[PDB]
Paper text:
The parasite adhesin [name] [name] ([name]) binds to Transferrin Receptor 1 (TfR1) and Transferrin (Tf) on the surface of reticulocytes, which is critical for red cell invasion. [name] interacts with TfR1 through its C-terminal domain (residues 461–633) with a buried surface area of ~1271 Å2, and with Tf through its N-terminal domain (residues 168–460) with a buried surface area of ~386 Å211. Here, we isolate and characterize anti-[name] human monoclonal antibodies from two individuals in Cambodia with natural [name] infection. To further elucidate how human mAbs recognized [name], we structurally characterized several antibody Fab fragments in complex with PvRBP2b169–470. We were able to determine eight crystal structures of PvRBP2b169–470 with antibody Fabs with resolutions ranging from 2.45 to 3.45 Å—[name]-241242 (3.15 Å), [name]-258259 (3.05 Å), [name]-273264 (2.55 Å), [name]-253245 (3.45 Å), [name]-237235 (2.45 Å), [name]-243244 (3.35 Å), [name]-251249 (2.90 Å) and [name]-283284 (3.15 Å).
253245 binds an adjacent overlapping epitope and makes contacts with α5, α6, α7, and residues S184–Y186 of the N-terminal loop. Our structural analyses that show all four antibodies binding overlapping epitopes are consistent with the results from the competition ELISA. Superimposing the crystal structures of [name]-241242, [name]-253245, [name]-258259, and [name]-273264 onto the [name]-TfR1–Tf cryo-EM ternary complex reveals that these antibodies cause steric hindrance with TfR1–Tf. The ability of these antibodies to directly interfere with TfR1–Tf binding is consistent with these antibodies showing inhibition in all interaction assays. Crystal structures of [name]-241242, [name]-253245, [name]-258259, and [name]-273264 show that these antibodies bind to the [name]-TfR1 interaction interface, and therefore inhibit through steric hindrance with TfR1. 241242, 273264, 258259, and 253245 competed with each other and were inhibitory in the reticulocyte-binding, FRET, and IP assays. 3E9 shows steric hindrance with 241242, 253245, 258259, 273264, and 283284, while 6H1 shows steric hindrance with 251249. Out of the 23 [name] human mAbs isolated and examined in detail, eight of these including 239229, 241242, 253245, 258259, 260261, 262231, 273264, and 346343 were inhibitory across all three of our functional assays; reticulocyte-binding, FRET, and IP.
Author numbering:
A (entry chain F): 6 to 217
B (entry chain D): 171 to 462
C (entry chain E): 7 to 30, 34 to 233
The structure:
Amino acid sequence: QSALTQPPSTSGSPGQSVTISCTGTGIDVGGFSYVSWFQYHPGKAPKLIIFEVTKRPSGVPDRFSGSKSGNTASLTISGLQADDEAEYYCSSYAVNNNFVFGTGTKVTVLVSPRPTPLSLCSHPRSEELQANKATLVCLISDFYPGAVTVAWKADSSPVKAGVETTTPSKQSNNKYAASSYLSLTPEQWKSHRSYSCQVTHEGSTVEKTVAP
Amino acid sequence: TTDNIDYFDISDESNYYLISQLRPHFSNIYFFDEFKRYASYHTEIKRYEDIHKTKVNSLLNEASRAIGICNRAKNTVKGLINILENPQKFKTQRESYDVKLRQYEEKKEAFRGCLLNKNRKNLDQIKKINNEIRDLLEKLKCSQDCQTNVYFDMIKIYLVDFKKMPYENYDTFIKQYKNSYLSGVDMIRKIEKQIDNPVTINAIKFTQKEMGYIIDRFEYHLQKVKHSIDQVTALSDGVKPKQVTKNRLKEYYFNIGNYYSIFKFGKDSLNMLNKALIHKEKIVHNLLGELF
Amino acid sequence: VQLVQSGAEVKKPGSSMKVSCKASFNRYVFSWVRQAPGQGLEWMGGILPILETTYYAKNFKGRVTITADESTSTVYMELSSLTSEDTAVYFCARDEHDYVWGSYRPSLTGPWGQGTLVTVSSASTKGPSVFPLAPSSKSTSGGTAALGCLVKDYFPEPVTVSWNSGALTSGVHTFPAVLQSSGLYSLSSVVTVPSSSLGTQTYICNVNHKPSNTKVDKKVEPKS
């Protein structure tokens, strides 16, 4: 039937607990005792964490424990660790050989510092301006959490055309990275005094500036 | 050569209710019979003869009256199965196998839909009694401090009623069947190219096409009974609150009754799906021996 | 046991794509689950080759077809009428037990495939236009100035960027690509080198885009 319900975000401190839910109907969750859970790392294959509502597979640590009561199944991860930070899906068998998943619950670990992003802005090069194109390369790195908002100001005037910003990406040192670009024309480049790249992160905005 | 086709059930488009050829046809009627025992306790809703005599019996009679309108369709498919699953009776007439195969699918779906279309108003009455049970349960003097003693006095009874059903025997019987059924599929698929027996092999294929459908239906209630057995067992060991809200108790009564009615609904079907499975396998044991 | 799927595929919109899933006794059911970017897992359908029954989710009515070959134990999933929303990572997941896992089939508590990514895009194969981002001597950021290369307009992903033929590793930071509205990709790679070496040491970024058979080496020099 309809996709199962899961909260998009759940938090928990290391050494404590966290509880996520899985709401369904009487034809998928509330119908059968076959409700499974899955820990998902992006890029790789999921891993079965819970089978038959409460049976644990081989190798799964004993702190993972699921349950259900009527129409809402719930999984509880006790003693959180750095490896537990992933997306957690729930699933259930349905009538007529149907199988439905959940919306996924992003689990986060509160055991980490929160550095502010370090922005590096690069002005257009002489080779790019000679091809009737202009791209301002604004680069963001070393920020936790991975949630930044980029704003561009063309000579103290907010510019919205030609802006392309990537989604955050976790780095090798467990921090996140992002980048933004501003497509312009050589006339617009040689017209203003200077451009800026404002990046707001956790209420604090860091801005860089380039000029011809 | 089967003499009964009561294993055929149909589900509505909403997939909430289930209609079966065996009485009381609906899973919710068993829940209505159990709700009379719930109302037999509380005095503020002790007037239970009105629900039993008027709504429930007329619903059970209107359900039994509805299936009688599909009797011609039931007797039509019963004749087509006995002819198709027996090559000696199929070869008496000269209709081709592929034509009889297409007629079986159309004549059977018309009989299944006859059980659903002739009970659309009965399904609308099923909702009328569920809202009637909720509107009647409002008459309790309790509100936020409702006692659950009768709720847990019932669970003790439901655990005893579950012990009479042999789940382990049904679990071993179905696995015994699916192994002898799948092994027969590999045997036919290995000799169909080396054996020149079209009228018999195709009839053996027609029997296996039904057997897989019965296992799909026999396992459904088995999953639902496992739900009724596992959920109620956790209620006797989980939290035992002495006081809940009036709306939470309405969710307490409609929960165990939905589990027990489904349990008693699965116990009746599996008792029939047992003989329905064995009969189809007795034919294969004789259709295979006739093949060799 | 283990499952092995085919490599990454890049198909044009409207075309037909098939994905394989080779397995190491094929009585189990074989499902197919994807995840669109920023979306959740979605079951598509299964197939019981012993009974020759094929299941399909309601959201996929006729667009997905599942075939199975007993000779090689390979289950195939073919998706017709490909749109830009079908770009996802497609998995194949078998059941835990064979027909005897109670009655939970299609259960997906069995082994999974390694994963196959499918990129549906209308853009054509194009080589990148690399531009050298000169190190800004005005902002040395404490003596460790930064230079880099701009990989603009390339398709498809990915591109491998190296500096000094891999000899220079400290300070290198290649940022993930951006997807422009024109369907083309763009990224950058920046190194952090001391400013004293900006006037004597040569720095050459090496961008390799194998799908287009293109490789560009740009000489990043100070502004002059």
